[PDB]
């Protein structure tokens, strides 16, 4: 086992939360109580669709023009990016830092496979960017990561939380960790180098 | 080499201590809320009782069992501890101290620390767990080439008076007896510890 390739969302950064908060603050500004339950139902729902559900709870889907709903949605996003900009190292997902440590302490190459154009900026904001020896600039965005790390895909694990990403990792011929994947953990804290080793050892045998 | 109090440094058990008391309050049927909890940070029991208007209701030996039941309840709830309750910089800080065979110690007042450390999944990373300013010494015994970290004025001075370098986690006057003061557990990394230590080390000689 030579490299571990990370994605950003739900793996390194708690983007999900930040989307929750985004949605919430807009709702304050629009005078509608938001909460996580509503949030959890609006998981995987169109941005425009989510907003309509919030508006319907507030009996306000008729109060607002399309134009205004557009701006609504625009602000949510600026709020979100704004929130993402104030990231600190206390915002690092549990288990992650310690995991990096082990991988380095053990001389495993570490990579990043995120679609975000601000990744380097973020890894820096999180104080872990020195840990990465390859960051891909925005499938096989994963095959690129392995090229950069100078290692076979067969010898890499990629950690991910998105349906699609896991497809990509798999198609890219790597051991895929989900957080339809080769190994699945509940929360990031569950990721130890030790579990990774063991499960990865088994993975390659079953082929 | 480096020593930790538990609560406020490695993890936060506040919620559990709270619940623990609230179950007792309920058993006595006396009003109890998080506001009180904070304010009351045995004297405590009397307080809720005096407040509850039941200052005469309980003996002392009964009163003692009311406490025994509480340590027992608490000791249970902390079962709900996962490594997810480890504090920001900690886990990594720990894997590093290990990598560089710096030694890892727990000098906590907590009576349940061993179970706590095991739920956090880090318990193996330690080598001295204290068992009840003597404390951090006892820990060292388990020694001026020593670091320790606290989040309270009390712990802080107990450390310096133990003659080591004292790293404070928090902010304010509660912090002004500390060698180092990071505003949160994340800020504290094996690097920063080192850089600020060799500077303390020198100022000795």
Element (H, E) at A3: strand A3-6
Domain final position from B86, B112, B131: B86
Question: Are both B185 and B205 inside the same structural domain?
Answer: yes
Residues forming beta bridges with residue A158, ordered by sequence position: A5, A176
Which of B82, B92, B99 lies closest to A97 in CB terms? B92
Distance from CA of A56 to the nearest CA of B (A): 35
Query: Are B83 and A97 within 8 A, CB to CB?
Result: no
Which of A94, A102, A127 lies closest to B86 in CB terms? A94
Question: Are both A125 and A147 inside the same structural domain?
Answer: yes
Rounded Cα distance between B112 and B78, Å, is: 9
Question: Are both A116 and A163 inside the same structural domain?
Answer: yes
Distance of CA A202 to the CA centre of its chain: 26
Query: Are B99 and A94 within 8 A, CB to CB?
Result: no
Distance of CA B54 to the CA centre of its chain: 32
User: Chain B residues with CB inside 8 Å of A190's CB?
Assistant: 83
Question: Are both A121 and A29 inside the same structural domain?
Answer: no
Rounded Cα distance between B94 and B153, Å, is: 24
Q: Residue B124 annotated as binding?
A: no
Question: Are both A21 and A120 inside the same structural domain?
Answer: no
Taking CA–CA distances from A102, the nearest residue in chain B reads: B95
Query: Judging by beta carbons within 10 Å of its beta carbon (0-12, 13-18, 19+), is residue B89 exposed, middle or buried?
Result: buried
Residues 6+ apart with CB under 8 A from A162: A7, A9, A10
Q: How long is chain A?
A: 207
3-class secondary-structure state, position B160? helix
Instruction: Spell out a b/e string for A150-169, using b for 16 or more CB atoms within 10 Å of the CB, else e.
Output: ebebebbbbbbbbeebbebb
Q: Residue B101 annotated as binding?
A: no
Rounded Cα distance between B120 and A68, Å, is: 48
Binding-site residue ranges of A for Mg(2+): 7, 9, 161
- Rg of chain B over CA atoms, in angstroms? 19
Question: Are both A118 and A87 inside the same structural domain?
Answer: no
Distance of CA A62 to the CA centre of its chain: 34
Distance of CA A137 to the CA centre of its chain: 16
Query: Are B95 and A89 within 8 A, CB to CB?
Result: no
Distance from CA of A7 to the nearest CA of B (A): 20
> CATH number of the domain that B57 lies in?
1.10.150.240
Closest of A73, A56, B86, A27 to residue A36, by C-alpha: A27
Q: Sheet harboring A156-160: ordered strands across? A: A134-135, A109-112, A3-6, A156-160, A175-178, A183-184
Question: Are both A97 and A168 inside the same structural domain?
Answer: yes
Rounded Cα distance between B99 and B76, Å, is: 33
Question: Are both A71 and A19 inside the same structural domain?
Answer: yes
B5 is catalytic: yes
Half-sphere exposure (Cβ direction) of B139: Cα atoms closer than 13 Å: 29
Reading the block at residue A108, the tokens are 């495993």
Structural biology method used: X-ray
Rounded Cα distance between A43 and A18, Å, is: 13
Which of B84, B92, B186 lies closest to A189 in CB terms? B84
Q: What angle do CA A16, A19, A20 make, to 5 degrees?
A: 90
Structural domain count, chain A: 2
Question: Are both A121 and A182 inside the same structural domain?
Answer: yes
Tell me whether strands A3-6 and A109-112 are parallel, antiparallel or unpaired: parallel
Domain final position from A40, A73, A92: A92
According to DSSP H, which parts of chain B are helical?
14-28, 34-39, 43-52, 60-77, 90-99, 113-120, 135-141, 153-160, 190-204
Distance from CA of B108 to the nearest CA of A (A): 23
3-class secondary-structure state, position B94? helix
Domain final position from A92, A115, A143: A92
Question: Are both A75 and A120 inside the same structural domain?
Answer: no
Which of A88, A101, A105 lies closest to B186 in CB terms? A88
Structural resolution in Å = 3.0
Instruction: Calculate helix-pair angle for A66-85, A47-57, nearest 10 degrees.
Output: 110
Taking CA–CA distances from A187, the nearest residue in chain B reads: B84
Question: Are both A69 and A107 inside the same structural domain?
Answer: no
> CATH number of the domain that A3 lies in?
3.40.50.1000
A87 lies in which domain range? Answer: 14-92
Instruction: Spell out a b/e string for A85-116, using b for 16 or more CB atoms within 10 Å of the CB, else e.
Output: eebebebbbbbbbbbbbbbbeeebbbbbbbbb
Question: Are both A98 and A60 inside the same structural domain?
Answer: no
Cα–Cα separations (whole angstroms), residue B17 to B12, B38, B108, B155, B156: 10, 11, 15, 19, 22
User: Chain B residues with CB inside 8 Å of A94's CB?
Assistant: 83-84, 86, 91
Phi then psi for residue A129, to 5 deg, are -65, -20
């Amino acid at each position: 086992l030579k490299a571990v390739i990370f994605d950003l969302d739900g793996v390194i950064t708690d983007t999900a939360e930040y989307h929750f908060l985004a949605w919430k603050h807009i709702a304050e500004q629009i005078d509608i109580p938001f909460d996580r339950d509503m949030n959890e139902r609006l998981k995987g729902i169109s941005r425009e669709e989510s907003l309509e559900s919030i508006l319907i709870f507030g009996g306000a889907e008729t109060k607002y023009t399309n134009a205004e709903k557009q701006e609504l949605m625009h602000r949510k996003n600026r709020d979100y990016q704004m929130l993402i900009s104030k990231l600190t190292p206390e915002d690092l997902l549990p288990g992650i830092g310690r995991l990096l440590c082990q991988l380095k302490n053990e001389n495993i190459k570490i990579g990043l496979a995120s679609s975000s154009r601000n990744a380097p900026k973020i890894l820096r904001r999180l104080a872990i960017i020195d840990d990465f020896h390859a960051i891909v600039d925005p499938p096989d965005i994963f095959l690129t990561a392995a090229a950069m790390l100078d290692v076979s895909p067969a010898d890499c694990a990629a950690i991910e939380d998105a349906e699609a990403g896991i497809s990509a990792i798999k198609s890219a011929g790597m051991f895929a960790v989900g957080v339809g994947a080769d190994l699945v953990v509940r929360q990031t804290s569950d990721l130890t180098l030790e579990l990774l080793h063991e499960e990865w050892e088994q993975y390659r045998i079953r082929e």
